[PDB]
Amino acid sequence: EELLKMWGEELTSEASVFEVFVLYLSGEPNRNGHKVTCLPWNDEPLAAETSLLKEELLRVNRQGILTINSQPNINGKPSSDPIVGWGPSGGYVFQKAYLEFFTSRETAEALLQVLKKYELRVNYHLVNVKGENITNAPELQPNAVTWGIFPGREIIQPTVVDPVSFMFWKDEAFALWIEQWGKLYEEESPSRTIIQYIHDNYFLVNLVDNDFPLDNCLWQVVEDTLELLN
Amino acid sequence: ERHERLREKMRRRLESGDKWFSLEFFPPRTAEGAVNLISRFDRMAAGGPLYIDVTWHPAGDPGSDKETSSMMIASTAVNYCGLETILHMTCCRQRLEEITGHLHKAKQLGLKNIMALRGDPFNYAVDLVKHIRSEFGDYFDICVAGYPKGHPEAGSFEADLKHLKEKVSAGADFIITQLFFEADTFFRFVKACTDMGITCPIVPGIFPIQGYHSLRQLVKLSKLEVPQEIKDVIEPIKDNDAAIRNYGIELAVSLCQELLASGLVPGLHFYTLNREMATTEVLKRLGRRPLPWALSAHPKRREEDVRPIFWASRPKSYIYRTQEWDEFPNGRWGFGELKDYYLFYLKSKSPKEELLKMWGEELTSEASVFEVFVLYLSGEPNRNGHKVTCLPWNDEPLAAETSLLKEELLRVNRQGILTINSQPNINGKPSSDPIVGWGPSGGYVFQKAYLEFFTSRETAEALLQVLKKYELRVNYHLVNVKGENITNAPELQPNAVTWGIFPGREIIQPTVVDPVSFMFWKDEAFALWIEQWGKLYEEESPSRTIIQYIHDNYFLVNLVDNDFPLDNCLWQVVEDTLELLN
Ligand SMILES: Cc1cc2nc3c(=O)[nH]c(=O)nc-3n(C[C@H](O)[C@H](O)[C@H](O)COP(=O)(O)OP(=O)(O)OC[C@H]3O[C@@H](n4cnc5c(N)ncnc54)[C@H](O)[C@@H]3O)c2cc1C
Ligand SMILES: Nc1ncnc2c1ncn2[C@@H]1O[C@H](CSCC[C@H](N)C(=O)O)[C@@H](O)[C@H]1O
Ligand SMILES: Nc1ncnc2c1ncn2[C@@H]1O[C@H](CSCC[C@H](N)C(=O)O)[C@@H](O)[C@H]1O
Structure with a gap:
């Protein structure tokens, strides 16, 4: 037993599942053993870039939208930057904001509803376990989300997100709700039951904000998702 | 189906x-x-x-x-x-x-x-x-x-x-x-x-x-x-x-x-x-846009969305010189090679000796040649009273994007920097911009500044002497008809002068500078002196010997400024070169 007590001994509701993400999104106290440094999806500590949006992620996951990775809108930082920088020196580095998460089944309706106004700017992709696949993405084509331009060189594009790779990743992206977390609990115990109601019948989601010279809209998508549900 | x-x-x-x-x-x-x-x-x-x-x-x-x-x-x-x-x-x-x-x-x-x-x-x-x-x-x-x-x-x-x-x-x-x-x-x-x-x-x-x-x-x-x-x-x-x-x-x-x-x-x-x-x-x-070059080629060429910038004022010679290919480039230009030289028309839309009235019947000196380039760029009538419609490398009136490079370009060209191709830095303008808006209508378009010219042995020497003060920022390439090649570009890699960012797509880079295919453009660029402008004069004359000396001894030079969100340094590198002369 290493991560059980860090993820909580007994889950009273989905709120006890939300309470595991916020204690990963900040170093914070717990009923026993304090800080948790891991989730099934998130074996790295938060990258230094995450400090730009840590307060937003804490807000988002405390509202029940269960973020499992992100990026900010960077708009051409120097390559040498210790927070957001890579490749040859002196060049530039760019990003699109990114927000990948799970939600309660009722919340996916809410998200699709609010995307009816942002479906030009925000590339979105929702998927339930067994298959229920909704997107505004180009049918086939990958979306580039981190790229860089370097003195005397070709454009480098290290981070890309796309509907085929996402539909493949989904088959692991649900399995470890059981294989890592759910397998800790007793057979059909109230914790296992609320985890199974979170494994099955629950939407994995991806969002990308394409308009990177602007402030990141993904927080407003989630705020309006919440508002709508409310 | x-x-x-x-x-x-x-x-x-x-x-x-x-x-x-x-x-x-x-x-x-x-x-x-x-x-x-x-x-x-x-x-x-x-x-x-x-x-x-x-x-x-x-x-x-x-x-x-x-x-x-x-x-x-x-x-x-x-x-x-x-x-x-x-x-x-x-x-x-x-x-x-x-x-x-x-x-x-x-x-x-x-x-x-x-x-x-x-x-x-x-x-x-x-x-x-x-x-x-x-x-x-x-x-x-x-x-x-x-x-x-x-x-x-x-x-x-x-x-x-x-x-x-x-x-x-x-x-x-x-x-x-x-x-x-x-x-x-x-x-x-x-x-x-x-x-x-x-x-x-x-x-x-x-x-x-x-x-x-x-x-x-x-x-x-x-x-x-x-x-x-x-x-x-x-x-x-x-x-x-x-x-x-x-x-x-x-x-x-x-x-x-x-x-x-x-x-x-x-x-x-x-x-x-x-x-x-x-x-x-x-x-x-009864009732143009996909790339900055207004049409990509039809037969066996649906793959083309990148080509070198050198030919972009003169595209049909690139198509003809590359017609042997199957690897018509898509992706980072990285592969197609112009291991090629050819027999030709080499004719303008004006008749074979008709445009002589716009380039001039009588070159007095190189300082008359320097005005033909400036008269073209200015849209100004020659001493004869005829507006220059083209030059041997660039059969077109030059593009709307190069209206941003008007007054500074013709100003530095007067001084013997004979520019034949050029480009603004753009800093992430929206797609559907009136002068640089190519590709999908939602998105952004980006460009480095670029300048390409012939220039004198003295001025080229000067520029080689000067560019050390910008060489972290400016990639440079210099060549002559004798094959003397000097350049500061990394491992002779291509240099992505234009790109665009579009919703849901990978990054698109429709034009590229490339120091290896500049060896294949070089021969075409220099030969267009004698084979269009030299041969427009009689077989042994001041005008022929002037043009043959320009062909024989001018350098061909290209520069690219890599700090594209900042103001262009190509303006204030040739001026930093003119100073040195004196
Ligand atoms: C779109 C178009 C393009 C043309 N291009 C050219 C060109 O490039 N070069 C050129 O020189 N001309 C061209 N012409 C002219 C054309 O070829 C003439 O109309 C010509 O006189 C007959 O050609 P056809 O293909 O129409 O002949 P057909 O279609 O074969 O018709 C000619 C006659 O053949 C008779 N006939 C056909 N099959 C039989 C049969 N099985 N048994 C008995 N009788 C039969 C028909 O009754 C008809 O009156 C063109 C015409 C058109 C409309
Ligand atoms: N549950 C969670 N909520 C928010 N962010 C998370 C998260 N789990 C991981 N992350 C962060 O999401 C980031 C995605 S990393 C992939 C993109 C990469 N930064 C690049 O541009 O090359 C990670 O760096 C990590 O710090
Ligand atoms: N004599 C001359 N002096 C300066 N520039 C010239 C010229 N003749 C042609 N040009 C310009 O050279 C440029 C090369 S093409 C520029 C790149 C390409 N348009 C892009 O897609 O980004 C053209 O805009 C052309 O108008």
Whole structure:
């Protein structure tokens, strides 16, 4: 037993599942053993870039939208930057904001509803376990989300997100709700039951904000998702 | 379902319900006319035409290797111009071997659409189509001429319809009709075609009247009688060709609208007769963007979305020099090689010794050459009073994006920095910008500053001496006709001067600087001194020896500024070089 007590001994509701993400999104106290440094999806500590949006992620996951990775809108930082920088020196580095998460089944309706106004700017992709696949993405084509331009060189594009790779990743992206977390609990115990109601019948989601010279809209998508549900 | 060439391409438009247009031309009897018509093919291609049809006659030697011959005109339309063509063919006074040889030659030239014609004095187009199918299978498109008001040689119209049945069922793919004067005639013979089991799509042909010779030309071509209404309209204006052009445009617009609104017409064939204005106006009245180069090439070149910037003021030589390739670049340019040098036209749109009045008959010194570049860039008339339309490297008026590089560019060019290609830094403008908005309409477009020029031995030396003060920021490349090569670019890698960011797509980089393909542009760039401007002068003269000295000893230089969100340093590097001189 290493991560059980860090993820909580007994889950009273989905709120006890939300309470595991916020204690990963900040170093914070717990009923026993304090800080948790891991989730099934998130074996790295938060990258230094995450400090730009840590307060937003804490807000988002405390509202029940269960973020499992992100990026900010960077708009051409120097390559040498210790927070957001890579490749040859002196060049530039760019990003699109990114927000990948799970939600309660009722919340996916809410998200699709609010995307009816942002479906030009925000590339979105929702998927339930067994298959229920909704997107505004180009049918086939990958979306580039981190790229860089370097003195005397070709454009480098290290981070890309796309509907085929996402539909493949989904088959692991649900399995470890059981294989890592759910397998800790007793057979059909109230914790296992609320985890199974979170494994099955629950939407994995991806969002990308394409308009990177602007402030990141993904927080407003989630705020309006919440508002709508409310 | 899947789609391919042949009927499936036009079946795509049929299913999508998109109306299209096609143009049909004639081969000229002179080489100059051939060049003019090739330029015309380039100009019409932007009108979104389905295909180009080239007529065939035996008196003009169409199967021969003369440039005026129809076969080479069609080949130039496709291979060296990038436009799909449909080749007409007639087999009167021809044998099996001749037809087979001509069809094989069409094979070798990439020609894949063939029109079957019987001509006027192998007895029928049925034999031609059947022989084509038997000897070359289904590799080629086959289309047969249709006769709505019946063949003049035929006793009965129903017999003509039956012969059309047989010809279509033999090997034909599409049917093209001749001139008309009433729309209802289209409908009646279309219904006849349907009722006889002919299921191929029928496309109507249109002759746009443009002059008084059109009436005689129309009568001779179609053997039909002009209606008394049109003649009476034309008779009182028998010497106002321009007015008849407007009247014919109106009549053609009415006919085309009636044809299209029917829904049985998938497209239109227009008999241009090697005339542009009326056809273009008609097409516009009936109702460019994917890359900063306004068209990517058609034949075997759907893959091209990156090419080197060097040729971008002169694109048709790049297409011609690269026609050997299969690896037409898509992705990071990283592969296609111009391991090539060639025999040529090297002719402007102005005649061979006509533009001498704009470049000057008499070069006094290099300081006269320096004004020809500046007169071009300024749009200013020469000492003769003639505005310079082009220079040997750049047959165009230079682009709207280079209006940002007007006053500074011509200012530094006066000083012996003879610029032949250039570009602004852009810093992430929205897509659909008026001067740099290429690609998908949502997104952003980005560019580095670029400058390319010839310059003197002294000024090149100076610049080599200076660039050390910017060499972290400026990639530079310098070469001469002697092959002396000096450059500061990493491992000779390409340099991505333009790119765009678009929702849901990977990053797109449509133009690139490349120090290896600059070795292949170099030879073309220097040779365009002697082979267009030197040879425009007499064989031993001040003007020839001046141009041969410029060819012999100027450096060719290219610079790129990598700090694209900051102000351009190419302005304030050549000025940092002018200072040093003194
Ligand atoms: C779109 C178009 C393009 C043209 N292009 C050219 C060109 O490139 N070069 C050129 O020289 N001319 C061309 N012409 C002119 C054309 O070739 C003439 O109309 C010519 O006189 C006959 O050619 P055809 O294919 O229409 O002949 P066909 O369709 O074969 O018709 C000619 C006559 O053959 C008779 N016939 C056909 N099959 C039979 C049969 N099985 N049994 C008995 N009788 C039969 C018909 O009754 C008809 O009157 C073109 C015409 C059109 C409309
Ligand atoms: N549950 C969670 N909520 C928010 N962010 C998370 C998260 N789990 C991981 N992350 C962060 O999401 C980031 C995605 S990393 C992939 C993109 C990468 N930064 C690049 O541009 O190359 C990680 O760096 C990590 O710090
Ligand atoms: N004599 C001359 N001096 C300066 N620039 C010239 C020139 N002749 C042509 N040019 C310009 O050279 C540029 C090269 S193409 C520039 C790159 C490309 N348009 C892009 O897609 O980003 C053209 O804009 C052309 O107009």
